[PDB]
Structure formats: structure tokens, C-alpha cells
Protein: RNA-directed RNA polymerase L
Organism: Hantaan orthohantavirus
Amino acid sequence: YIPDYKGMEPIGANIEDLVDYSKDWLSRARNFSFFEVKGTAVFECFNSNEANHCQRYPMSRKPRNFLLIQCSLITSYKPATTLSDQIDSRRACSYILNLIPDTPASYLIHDMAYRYINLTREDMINYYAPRIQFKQTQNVREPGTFKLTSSMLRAESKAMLDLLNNIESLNIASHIVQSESVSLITKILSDLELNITVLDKFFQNETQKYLIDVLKKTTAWHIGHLIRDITESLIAHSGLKRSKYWSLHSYNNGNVILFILPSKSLEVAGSFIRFITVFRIGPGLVDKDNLDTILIDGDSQWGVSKVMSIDLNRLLALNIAFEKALIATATWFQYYTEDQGQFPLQYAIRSVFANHFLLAICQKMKLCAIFDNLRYLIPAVTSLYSGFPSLIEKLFERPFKSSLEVYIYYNIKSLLVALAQNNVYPSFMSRIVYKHYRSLISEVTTCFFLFEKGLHGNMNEEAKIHLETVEWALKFREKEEKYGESLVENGYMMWELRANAELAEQQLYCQDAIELAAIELNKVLATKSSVVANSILSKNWEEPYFSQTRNISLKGMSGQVQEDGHLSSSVTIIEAIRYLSNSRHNPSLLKLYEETREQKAMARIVRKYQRTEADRGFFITTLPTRCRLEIIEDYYDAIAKNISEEYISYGGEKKILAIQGALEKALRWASGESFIELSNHKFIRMKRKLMYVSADATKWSPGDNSAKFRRFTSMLHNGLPNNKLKNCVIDALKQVYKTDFFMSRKLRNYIDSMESLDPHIKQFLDFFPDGHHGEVKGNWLQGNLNKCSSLFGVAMSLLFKQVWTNLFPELDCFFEFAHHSDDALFIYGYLEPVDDGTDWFLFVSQQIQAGHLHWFSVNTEMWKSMFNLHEHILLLGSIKISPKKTTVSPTNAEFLSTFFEGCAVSIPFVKILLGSLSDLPGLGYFDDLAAAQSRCVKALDLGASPQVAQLAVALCTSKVERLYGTAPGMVNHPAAYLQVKHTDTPIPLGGNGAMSIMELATAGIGMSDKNLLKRALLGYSHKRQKSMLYILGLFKFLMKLSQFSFIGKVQWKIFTPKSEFEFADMYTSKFLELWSSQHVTYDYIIPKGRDNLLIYLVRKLNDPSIVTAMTMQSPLQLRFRMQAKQHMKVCRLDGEWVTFREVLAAANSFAENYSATSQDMDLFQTLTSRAKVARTFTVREKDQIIQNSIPAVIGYKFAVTVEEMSDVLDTAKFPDSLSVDLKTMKDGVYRELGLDISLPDVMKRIAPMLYKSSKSRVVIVQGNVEGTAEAICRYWLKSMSLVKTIR
RNA sequence: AGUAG
């Protein structure tokens, strides 16, 4: 039942009024939005901005710090061990104790060295003992720490400790300051380059010889490992029970020392690890001006650095600095090979590695912002027209504090000026000149991704994300005051626009414009009304609201306005349980809207933690607000699925294929000739062309008026027999017009716990009458109505197309539009005269003299007027194209973060390769390894070479093994316990997963276990080998102990909270277990009943994996804590929680005593037996003989109760064909896999991988490759060599 | 003093 609501009646708007308004609009000179790119223009912009800069910032004489860790090497570096650490610390402290301190930090390190050298023998044993062998002592209360205290610290050291406990810019217009910095970063970079004192066949001659053999001798390659060791030692002395003590470590035969001070643990947010690095002055990361002091010892100088405080983000970023720099250099290597057709020289790759390492070591936010703006500037100076004046003026909205900033500046100033004179792409980071723009843009993008996400000041960004919303809400209120509420809400009409012409502003919309846009979109929709209606009804508006995973998910949500006033922070599942508890029924989406219609919409904002400067916000809304948004979004997603110009409606892999196809039709059009029918039969010849506008929308959601959608929905065709659903959608849009937006508790506390209520914080607190929430109108909040706003933009673009077509019927232009929310691409196909324009100018003059004055806008550069009118018509719908981040170029496009050179894709796969090093699922060794390898395979699919991917895979595997302890020689190492080699142990048991990218991309992510099982089977069955039987016993241990690992996998619960959450004690554990046993169908389908659903959700609240997920503050807390948890008991065995070593011991015990039964063997032999274009890949053959879904059939088999059967039939596309499907399904599993699912306890294990066939793989092939999987595999085979043909 | 601004 759909409720009854009042809709909107048409106002009878005719396109002819808009066409006449456009004729009057285009008859005058219009100021273009973009400035032509000329060398003199860019040079003068830089000069004027340099001159202006110094008068806006206080002058700075002292360059600031940019090196997070300062250290130097003169000999090769061997990895640190415990004995090496002991000997090196002894020697280094003996060295330091002979120095003469002069600064407070020097005195502090002197005292620490004295304390370490005056430790007892028992103290040293307990200091270097393992966890299981450590015995506390008066001084060494923890392993790897000691205990200083007052009376063991000089006054000059207590002064430094109390100082710890308790914007000026550099002259960039100066040549003394701008050359003193280039001579500092060019010796750090010139010291990091000094040499210190089937796929494998191709990798050994190309990548291993020209990249990994050249860099393996540099100072950077060894300082990377030294800093890895230093960061590991810092991570160890950061956990709870340790961070509050002192520590002292030594590296490189005592040449480097690390004095770790007491500091807050990094488990609690907002804490820093404090350390000092005393080293031997030499080549490397040494900035002598930012060292605390330099102490001489006759001949050798020792550099004592400042007390560095590093948070967990930067600390974990410095631990993978070597891997990050190496991956970036390996990507630059491949890009150079593809650009110049030959391998780089030694010096080039060495300098590239040094630059990447320096970037990865200096994890500052100022440099991150500079590199964020550079990737916008570079596209703005290699294009015909752009907004480079604004981008450059923004580049100077920075104080340049460190030498590394005034060096990257000095480089950008030269690069951008050189690029504007050659429109031959000079390199930003080497002395080479590229042949393609993609090489340079990818080179700078890689340097942008060397900085981590979330380097901003935490509270600064918490304020920034609120000020934008408050400012635009105030702007909307001011517009309501000027023109009244009725005009701003219902929108103005054309006759008012003509009389004012200032009504065409943002947050204001024109009724006639939206009605005509809806009619233009109807011109497409009405041709497929049945399809649109069926797609709308396919959204299942009658199904219960809380039986959908998105409505019970783990994502954040808002609750109630607590007594404090703030809006509760909760989870979606918590609110679902709360609603069901106090309800009698499971309400449909529409019936839950009737009970929550009068409850105002509420919202809160949280940080998104982006890599870009000026982090953006994310909105968390209450349950009524979510129901409204789901109604609107279901309606508009169903409608927009059938509009090709809407790109959100694509799955995510189809966006690139669609934009490529659009560009192909554009190019096909351009390969033609236009003929304008001059009087009589004479024809004027015209050459077709194309111009690409990479439009970006300014303040998409903030500067908007959601009311424009209510009219838009009214006129928008859907094909349904009545308007009940349309009226409901209009009503939902009405209910989201006004929102109560709440300040975060963090920001409210900060403002309250303060004394300087300065301006810009007094007009911010006036938005909230009670100081907790304020009313926002018009704005629909970021990300809530994406598919509605994008569809509206598409409609307005189509309206512009129609208006231009009516304006110039004689001409033959070609418009292509792509919209993806605050991102668009416009291809304008215009005509130009051939040879001199003797006839074209005459025709234009005749038309202008005939009364068609608007032809004044097509005399020359049609595309200029095309874009002017398109922009104006878009503004009439309250859409503003960004004059800064929009680029116009006839031979280059940028869309969806992907670069196009007409019809050639270029995707930054570096982001995927570097993301595999961090942000792991953290569900255990097997899951994390399979996730890192999956992310490397994805990079391979996005265009990474089979050799750049093979290096990233090696790095990821090594890092995962080191982070879980399974690499050779550590705790959890299988060889210590198991009797088989590291290469023969199953991966779930710490086995060596070291597998080629070429087979991880085709066979799968978990075939190493399957290959091992096949090898063991063959060996045992052909020779009766005892070791093979041992391997089979390990496999059986994993199978009983049971990313999908069919042969089983250790079950981990890494996180367990101290506090239980709301509505978790409704049903006791015994009752939940009994309910799970009785109702087996509810393991594969969500109950469609209040009682069953409530019990199901309470049970889901008591799932270890869900418990771990709900207690997780970013992946940083995982990669941070795991170093300790590998010792702790985080695995499941015998029904309790034990260590992974205990699991290894149990596996060894069972395998050693394992015997080959007949069923085990039966099951084992049942188990073992050019143009860079984008295409699709398909690894699964057609097995779709099932009409219903897999959950429906699996639940149907176990369906016995009437309620269970009813819940199964509701969750089925074809409830009348379940039984047949099941039978077919059985055959389909017994004819391909040989497993009988009818047997109990068999189908439960097989099911979790029957959930497949949806992996829509998109691969960036070289163009000649067909879409077949075999063709793509052969292309990967042929691409194993970088600079050779290996057919 | 560092991060940050």
C-alpha cells in the first residue's frame, strides 16, 4: 500500500521562451571563463605572485624542519638483531660517553647513555630477554626498556624534559634564499645516490638488472632498511606498559643511536612517540641546520638531532618508506620504458629513487598540499584554455617554511613555465624530456601518493568541515531574505529572470528550466517506458526495511538528541534493533516512511581523512532521514540506470568502458566533413573538430537547492500507471528540505574549552541557536542524493543541446556529455572554415544582417560560445562549472581520475600498488596475504607491468610475513614447530606464499595450498612418502579446525572490546545457540519477521568478526598492534583462545600421528581432480542455469518451518522455481566439482564459494587484445618484457 | 623541541 500525497501540477513551459532568451543572450559579447595558456602569461603570473607573497607573510630567516628522521651511513647495512643490538649499544654508548655535551638534548642523551652503561648483568638479561623469559627488575621493568628518574638527570636535561612537557614564511622572491635551499636538497639528494662501501627470466634481465641492481648499492637503499629498523624499535616502545619508560637502541656497529624518551602510548589517539637520533656525521639524510648540535671527538663528528615527536600515522608511514619509494621508482621505470622505448640510465633511476625516498621520509602536510595543487596546475598549463591564474594564485597561498618547500617551489616554477611555452614535456624530477603528457602527469601523481592520508591538524579540519556547511546555509538564508521564501523554495520563472538577469545564481533555480530539462530527459525515457517502470518496481518497495543488509549494516548512523543536546553516534544495526524492539512489525520502506514522516531530518559531520588539502566531510543521518534518502535514491537510481550519460549508475568497472565508447563516437564524428547549404545549391565546406572540457562543479551539494528536484520528479517520466510512487518521492524530497545539522562533540568541546572566541567563530556559533544544532535548508548534504543530482545535471546538459540545436539549425555540431556528480566531461564537436574564411565570414555577416543576431557568437571559435551557453543553462539549474579546476584542450581529457589522450586510457595504478603495503583486513595471516596479493592483481589489471607487479607482490609478501612473524626466523615461524619446509607448509599455518603474479591473476589467490595438496597427494600415492603424509595430516588438521579457504584456516579474533554495546544482552548465549541450531535456514537469508529478525540481529551482535569490526579505529591500530599480538593468544583452538604457536604445535601433533583413511583419500582425489584500451575479463564459465539467487536456494534446502519457508519465498526472484533450481544446482555442483551437496555438513562448506560470478574484472590491455580471458592472459604473457617483443 | 597552524 502506497500512501496518498499531493503532487505538483505543470506550469506549461515551452522551449521557445528559452530559445528566445538564448538568442538575446548570445547576441552580445560574453566574457569567457578561461584564460589562454601562454608562456608569458604563466611567467607574469608567477612573477606578480612572487612579488605579492612577501607583503602578506611575516619574513622568516630560519628554515624549518622537514626531515622526520635524520641519519647517515658510510658502509653497507646489515639487518639488526638482538646480539648485534647489544654489542652496538655497548660500543655506541662507550663512544658517546667521551663527548662533551653542550645543549640540553646532548646532556639528556649523555645521561641516558650513562644509565644504560651502568645497568646490571641481570638488568641486561631482562632487557634483551623475550617475553616468555622476561623477569622484572628494579630498573628493567619491561623488556627493551630501562628506568631513569630525577637524581639521575642533570638540570640541563630536566630543563629539556620540562620544555617538552609544557605563520612566518621564507623569502621565495630572493635568489639568496632560493639558491641556499636548492644547494641543500641537491646534496641530500646527491648523497642518497652515492654507492655505499618464465616471468623470472624476463625479470632477471630487465628489472633485476637495470632497477634492482642499480639501486641496491645506493645510500638510500640502506638508509631505508636502517629507518625500517629504527621505526620497528620505535613501534615496540610505544605500546601500553612500555611507552612510559626510557629506551636506548643502536644500529650499524654503533654508528647510529636511538634514544627513546617517555611518551604517551600510540594506542590512545593524539599521542606522539618522542625520540632522538645520535649518529655519525656522514652522507645521507642530514640537514645540519636542523640538528640539535654537532659534537666533535677529535676527528669524527657526531650529529645530535632534535627531539622528534612522531604520531602513529607518520610512524607507520616511515616504516614502509623504503617499500613506498621502491614501488614509486619501479613505476617511474616502467613509465620511462613505455615513453622513450628504452630503459633509463643508471643516474636517472638513482636520482628518481633518491627523490622518492626523500619525499617518503618527509611526511609533512605542507608538501602534501603543494603536491596536491601541482597535479591540478600541470593539467592547467598543458591545455589550450584553463584557469591557471587562479590555480597559481592559490599555489602562493602558502608559507614556505622549510628548504624542501622552497626547492619543490623552485622546481614547479620552472616546470610550469617551460610547459606553457611548448604547447616535449620536461620532467619534474629528472633531466629527461618526455614525449607524452601521460608520463609527466603520472610522474607527479606518483609523488602525490607518497604522502599518507590524514596528515592534517585534527582539530583544524574538524572546524573546516563545519564552516563550509554553515557558510552555505547562511548564504541560502540570505537569499531567502532577499527574494523571499517562496521564490527561493519554488524557484523563479523565466519572465523574472529576463527582468532581473541576476536570478541566474547558485542556490537559485528556474522553474521553466527544470520543467524543460525534465521534458528533454523524457524524450529519451518515453522510448523505454516499460524498462524504466520495471526497473523502478524491481527495487521491491514492499519488502521489509530492516531485512536489507544496507539497513542493518555496520556503518555509522545517528540516534537521538541526547539530554546533553548532541546527536547520538551509533551503528545502523543498533538502530534497527532499537526500532524492532519497540515495534510490533517489520515495516516496508514506504510504510516506515508514514510512521517517520513528521520526524525532522537530522545529520552530523565527520572527517573523511583524505590525502588532499582541506579534507572533506561525511554526513551521518538518523533513521527517518535514511528512509527518505533510500526512497529518493531507489527511485532515481532505477530511473537513471537507463540514461547512458549518467555514470554513477554504472557498477564501477563499466564507467571506463562507457567513457571510452563515448570518446570513440566523438572521434568517429570528427572524421567527417560538414556542408552548410548556402543560397541556391552552393555549399560551404567546413572541417569538423573536437574540444574536450574537463568540467568540475563548484560546491555541488553546498551551493544547491534540493527543491529543484521536486519539480524535476513531477515531470520526469517513469511509466507507472499512477503517480502514487512519484508523489511519495516528491513528499520525501520535501521532508529532506530542512535538516538539523549538529556540531561534533569534539568541536563543541574545543570551542567551549577555550577563551579566544575570535571572529569567524562567533558567526559560526550563531548558526546553532542552542549551540548544538542549526537548521540547514536547500543543501541536501554530500553523498546523499548523488544519483539524483547527476541525473539532473544530465537533463540540463540535454536541454542545452536542444537549445543550441534550435538556435543554429543550419550548423551540424556534436555534443557528448558525461556526468558523475561533481565531475563532468563535455565533448564539443564544432566546425571551422577550410582555408581562408572568405565564405564563412560572408555567410555569418549575411545571417547577422538578416536579423539572426546570435550568429555573432559563431564567427570564430564556435566551441567558446557552445561552452558559454552550456554553462549558463547549467547555472539556470543551480549548477556552477568550476572556473579553476576546469580544463579545455583539443587532445587531452581527464575524467574519473583517469587521463585520456583522445581514446587512450591512463589510470594511476600506483595508488593500488602502494595501498597493498597498508590497510590490510587484519583477519589473520591467510586473509591479509590474500588481500595484499589481491590488491597487487588489481594493479596488474589496471595497467601495471607483469614485472612492476611482481616486485610489489614480493614486497607485500615480505611485509606480511614480517608483520605476522612467519618470515624465516621469528615467533610463529612454521619451520620451528612443523617438520616440513617453509615452502611445504600450508599458507594458513604460516606457509610460504611466494607465488608469481602471472598465476595469482589467472588461477586465483589461494592455489598455493591447492598446489601443495596436489603435490602431497601425488607423492604419497606414488611413493608412500612419510613427509607427504605429514603434509596431508596438516591439511586434515586445518580441515577439522574449519577470503574462502576451502581446506580451512585458523580463526582469529584480534580485537575484543572491554565494554559490551547496547541491545547485546536481550537473549542469552544458550538461547542463541539453540536458535541457530534449530533455524538453520537463517544462516543464508535474513528473517522477514520481527521476532526472528530481532533474534538474528542480536545473534549477529555476538559474532567475533562483527565484534572486531565494530571496534576498529582505522587500519593504523591493526598494523600498529600486530607486532605485539603475534605473541598474544588471538587464535581459536579446542573451543578456546590460544596463540598461533599453540595451533602450530597442535597441527604438528596431529600430523605426526595422522593415518591415511579411505574417506580422507577419496575426498583428496575428489579435490585435486599502442592504444591503451580497456576490456573485460571472465574467468568463470556459464553456470547460470539458476533463476533465483544462491542464498535463496541454500536457505530453501534447509527450509522446514512455515515461517522459514515464507521467508525463503520472499527472498527469491522466482519463488515458483526454487525446487527445480535446487535439483539443477545439485547437478551443477556434482558435474563440475564432484561434491554432493545433499549430504549434511557438506553444503555448508561448499556454499561460501558458490557466491561468485560477480567479479566484473576490467583490464587495461594494449588494444589488440580481445575481451576473452585467454586473449588477456596471452597479452600478459607478451608483456613480460618491457622493451622487447616476445610473441 | 617536534607535529600542526
